[PDB]
Design a protein around this motif. Sequence first.
Motif, mmCIF file in Angstrom:
data_model
loop_
_atom_site.group_PDB
_atom_site.id
_atom_site.type_symbol
_atom_site.label_atom_id
_atom_site.label_comp_id
_atom_site.label_asym_id
_atom_site.label_seq_id
_atom_site.Cartn_x
_atom_site.Cartn_y
_atom_site.Cartn_z
ATOM 1 N N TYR A 1 -4.334 16.631 1.431
ATOM 2 C CA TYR A 1 -3.503 15.454 1.255
ATOM 3 C C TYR A 1 -3.524 14.875 -0.144
ATOM 4 C CZ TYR A 1 -7.824 12.547 1.615
ATOM 5 O OH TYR A 1 -9.049 11.932 1.470
ATOM 6 N N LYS B 1 -11.315 1.544 7.367
ATOM 7 C CA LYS B 1 -12.413 1.321 6.426
ATOM 8 C C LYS B 1 -12.620 -0.171 6.148
ATOM 9 C CE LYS B 1 -9.369 2.638 2.503
ATOM 10 N NZ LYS B 1 -9.490 1.433 1.636
ATOM 11 N N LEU C 1 -12.480 9.392 3.720
ATOM 12 C CA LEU C 1 -11.538 9.464 2.599
ATOM 13 C C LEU C 1 -12.178 9.545 1.215
ATOM 14 C CD1 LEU C 1 -9.040 6.770 3.855
ATOM 15 C CD2 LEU C 1 -8.670 9.245 3.881
ATOM 16 N N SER D 1 0.755 3.145 4.412
ATOM 17 C CA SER D 1 1.679 2.274 5.150
ATOM 18 C C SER D 1 3.091 2.243 4.558
ATOM 19 C CB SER D 1 1.156 0.831 5.214
ATOM 20 O OG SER D 1 0.103 0.691 6.147
ATOM 21 N N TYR E 1 -3.348 2.165 -8.797
ATOM 22 C CA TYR E 1 -2.222 1.428 -8.251
ATOM 23 C C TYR E 1 -1.276 0.831 -9.290
ATOM 24 C CZ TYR E 1 -3.998 2.100 -3.551
ATOM 25 O OH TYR E 1 -4.439 2.729 -2.414
ATOM 26 N N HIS F 1 -2.406 10.877 -2.301
ATOM 27 C CA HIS F 1 -2.215 9.451 -2.067
ATOM 28 C C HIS F 1 -1.259 8.914 -3.131
ATOM 29 C CE1 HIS F 1 -3.176 5.504 -0.547
ATOM 30 N NE2 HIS F 1 -3.546 5.092 -1.743
ATOM 31 N N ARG G 1 -7.355 8.913 -9.193
ATOM 32 C CA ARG G 1 -8.600 8.511 -8.531
ATOM 33 C C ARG G 1 -9.434 9.732 -8.153
ATOM 34 N NH1 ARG G 1 -8.000 4.299 -3.646
ATOM 35 N NH2 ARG G 1 -6.972 6.118 -2.698
ATOM 36 N N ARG H 1 -1.254 8.153 7.391
ATOM 37 C CA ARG H 1 -2.482 7.356 7.270
ATOM 38 C C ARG H 1 -2.002 5.897 7.204
ATOM 39 N NH1 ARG H 1 -2.980 10.946 3.330
ATOM 40 N NH2 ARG H 1 -3.103 9.388 1.640
ATOM 41 N N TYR I 1 -13.302 -3.646 -4.424
ATOM 42 C CA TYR I 1 -13.300 -5.055 -4.067
ATOM 43 C C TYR I 1 -13.849 -5.402 -2.680
ATOM 44 C CZ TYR I 1 -8.515 -4.131 -2.111
ATOM 45 O OH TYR I 1 -7.388 -3.703 -1.446
HETATM 46 C C1 LIG Z 1 -6.684 7.622 0.757
HETATM 47 C C2 LIG Z 1 -6.033 6.418 1.452
HETATM 48 N N1 LIG Z 1 -5.144 6.671 2.435
HETATM 49 C C3 LIG Z 1 -4.514 5.714 3.118
HETATM 50 C C4 LIG Z 1 -4.726 4.341 2.837
HETATM 51 C C5 LIG Z 1 -3.979 3.307 3.633
HETATM 52 O O1 LIG Z 1 -3.211 2.532 2.709
HETATM 53 P P1 LIG Z 1 -2.418 1.234 3.176
HETATM 54 O O2 LIG Z 1 -3.512 -0.113 3.615
HETATM 55 O O3 LIG Z 1 -1.378 0.681 1.808
HETATM 56 O O4 LIG Z 1 -1.411 1.657 4.579
HETATM 57 C C6 LIG Z 1 -5.662 3.983 1.796
HETATM 58 C C7 LIG Z 1 -5.922 2.561 1.479
HETATM 59 N N2 LIG Z 1 -6.741 2.196 0.566
HETATM 60 C C8 LIG Z 1 -6.709 0.895 -0.163
HETATM 61 C C9 LIG Z 1 -5.271 0.384 -0.424
HETATM 62 P P2 LIG Z 1 -7.568 1.162 -1.678
HETATM 63 O O5 LIG Z 1 -6.945 2.311 -2.297
HETATM 64 O O6 LIG Z 1 -7.444 -0.131 -2.623
HETATM 65 O O7 LIG Z 1 -9.094 1.462 -1.234
HETATM 66 C C10 LIG Z 1 -6.320 5.011 1.106
HETATM 67 O O8 LIG Z 1 -7.211 4.736 0.106
#
Ligand SMILES: Cc1ncc(COP(=O)(O)O)c(/C=N/[C@H](C)P(=O)(O)O)c1O
Lengths: 380, 380
Positions: free
Chosen positions: B163, B38, B84, B203, A264, B165, B135, B218, A283
């Motif tokens: 997909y 999740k 995921l 989001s 991120y 991210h 990642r 997603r 986390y």
């Molecule tokens: C592969 C994937 N897709 C979609 C989402 C949805 O993201 P968002 O809450 O910004 O709409 C996440 C969220 N993950 C947490 C943000 P982390 O990566 O820290 O586990 C994700 O890891």
Amino acid sequence: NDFHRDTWAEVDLDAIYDNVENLRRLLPDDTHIMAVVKANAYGHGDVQVARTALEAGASRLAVAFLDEALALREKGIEAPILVLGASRPADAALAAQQRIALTVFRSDWLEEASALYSGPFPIHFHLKMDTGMGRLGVKDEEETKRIVALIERHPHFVLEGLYTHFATADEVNTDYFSYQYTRFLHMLEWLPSRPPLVHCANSAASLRFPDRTFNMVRFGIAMYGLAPSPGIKPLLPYPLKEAFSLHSRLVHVKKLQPGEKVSYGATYTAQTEEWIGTIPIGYADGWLRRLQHFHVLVDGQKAPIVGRICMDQCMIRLPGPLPVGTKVTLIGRQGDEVISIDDVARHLETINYEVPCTISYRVPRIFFRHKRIMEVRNAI
Amino acid sequence: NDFHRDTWAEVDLDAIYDNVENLRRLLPDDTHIMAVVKANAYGHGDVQVARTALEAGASRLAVAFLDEALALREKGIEAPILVLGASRPADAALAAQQRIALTVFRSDWLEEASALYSGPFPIHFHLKMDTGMGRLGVKDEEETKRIVALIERHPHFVLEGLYTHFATADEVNTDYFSYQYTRFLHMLEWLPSRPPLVHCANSAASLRFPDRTFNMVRFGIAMYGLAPSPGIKPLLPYPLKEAFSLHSRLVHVKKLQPGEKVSYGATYTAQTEEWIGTIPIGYADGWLRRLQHFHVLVDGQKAPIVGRICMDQCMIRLPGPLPVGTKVTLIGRQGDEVISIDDVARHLETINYEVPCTISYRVPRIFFRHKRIMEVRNAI
Ligand SMILES: Cc1ncc(COP(=O)(O)O)c(/C=N/[C@H](C)P(=O)(O)O)c1O
Ligand SMILES: Cc1ncc(COP(=O)(O)O)c(/C=N/[C@H](C)P(=O)(O)O)c1O
């Protein structure tokens, strides 16, 4: 029980047995040990630790609130349990039926409970005095006598205990400790008679002044092998054995080229050709984001966490190409290297108490007893 | 269920419904919404949120690891679920049998799964590509073709989607975003045929560029009514309804005289004649020690948390002598004032994502739907 993610915590019950049994040796035989297993035993597993502590010499258990006590009953624990915190007067009947002792510190609570309960089970109360902690407890003589009177009048209300709690028992300097101890002594004199159980000591007070514990100690943090504070580490009578350790495994390994970014905000940038590993812990597992400049252990070596920590996973720089599935230790030992809860605590800028309590329900607990796996507890 | 301590969280499912329905209206008929649920739905409650989201227009669910998916299945959710994160090749049969789709990103994983699984259920895989997040995901051409081949080659392996991210979709600066978007369009060309489901937006990207999201979004953080970042806030198409709130009640009130100390290390000294209240929430509930100078709401007013935060309790300086039982709002609205999760995150020096996730299993969740209490979930 089973789990399907390669991230787990290990709880060494043999360590717990030793920490409690050494206390049993240290204290006078007439002094009981109440093991405090609130907060799911400081994140170690409530019933597993309870059973173990009782085996090593503990006779009672302490919890924070009613639900915790009820959960221990449902899991087969029949020993006495004291609720250290507040409870609803309306729940006095349920506590009495399950044989759960309650802490009381105000008369208006007892006014209310006398009107909602009338036998046949007796409710055992422990009167809580505030001698300097400022949390819960009585502070006046009139209120103390009012509470005792109201308990004396109800045929099913029993005063089994009387206690206080220290705010600085873990400080090398004992000035405030002394004020509190002396204040407790004065306040005890406000009772018409001594109840059978008088207690005040937590881990630090009982390990440092075994002779000043009256007849029951509330043993917490030290039972898990963690020192109350670093200050008194050298003042401890017997060596403590840490029981908690946290592990994971590499699920992805890859080599980056100079210039590529990680995680991120794209905060990290590889500068040479480096190997990046991904582990399934983030986390939401209690491995907080503030730990992004910390490290983990991989193949007996220290490896830095790289980039920002995610909700379920994080990245680390590897020494070189390691195979997927290689064990990673977040808390514990690997070879000659070791990461203790105090190390994590320092980095999170907190006390050791908070670390194992933050490792969430999402993380499986594997219990070891006699050097072999006893059971696996996967909350979800 | 029911709980026996006056500390509880409130989850407004109506807010969650609206946050999803608005996206459903903002998106094209062909595009699916995969609700990211999740980490127990970001601390909001997995089944309760999954069910509400489905009713609002979502057609699929996303989880972090296998155990979370199995948990949803065991609670009656029968909608599609995508894991995921990573999983073990040996658990592929379990996933197939429970109709759970898995993320794949390494060819050696498939080679192993193939030898272990022969049928009879088909397993749907989603190929993760790494465009610049570092990642999980495949990065090279021939790794992709080898995976596709291994899937095509197996009678029960199906490539349902692929997909990526985005690492900086919430950043005003869209430069790294366009680099990842471009990298993705290019890597899509390594596939002979475009699979039925192609997704990339979280989001931020879905709410900012709803047309450049292909056929599946997603949706996570925004579903819970939380902005991906403070910078994206005034760029969102519709207002988000915050769904999570946290409350407790005073279990003790007392007047301290000057010089008197409060809590551990006696780090707070009363200077005037102050009324101090004790609430039953602490760090073991996710209300971390770092929140020591934060302000909660009591009787419509901001009141500071005084002294060190304990494992199950903490103290506040009251505006005056309020009765025991008075509601204290840690997160939420109290008439004129409001404390949002963004306010807590600011004090903890973290992002909103981490806050609800940290509020532990120990805290009951009360759910509201159609403006009425619907359910109470108490983990212990
Ligand atoms: C592969 C994937 N897709 C979609 C989402 C949805 O993201 P968002 O809450 O910004 O709409 C996440 C969220 N993950 C947490 C943000 P982390 O990566 O820290 O586990 C994700 O890891
Ligand atoms: C009343 C009482 N007695 C005994 C103990 C055991 O103390 P220790 O783990 O240092 O041996 C505690 C611990 N509490 C946590 C330290 P908190 O106050 O944060 O709820 C306690 O509150």
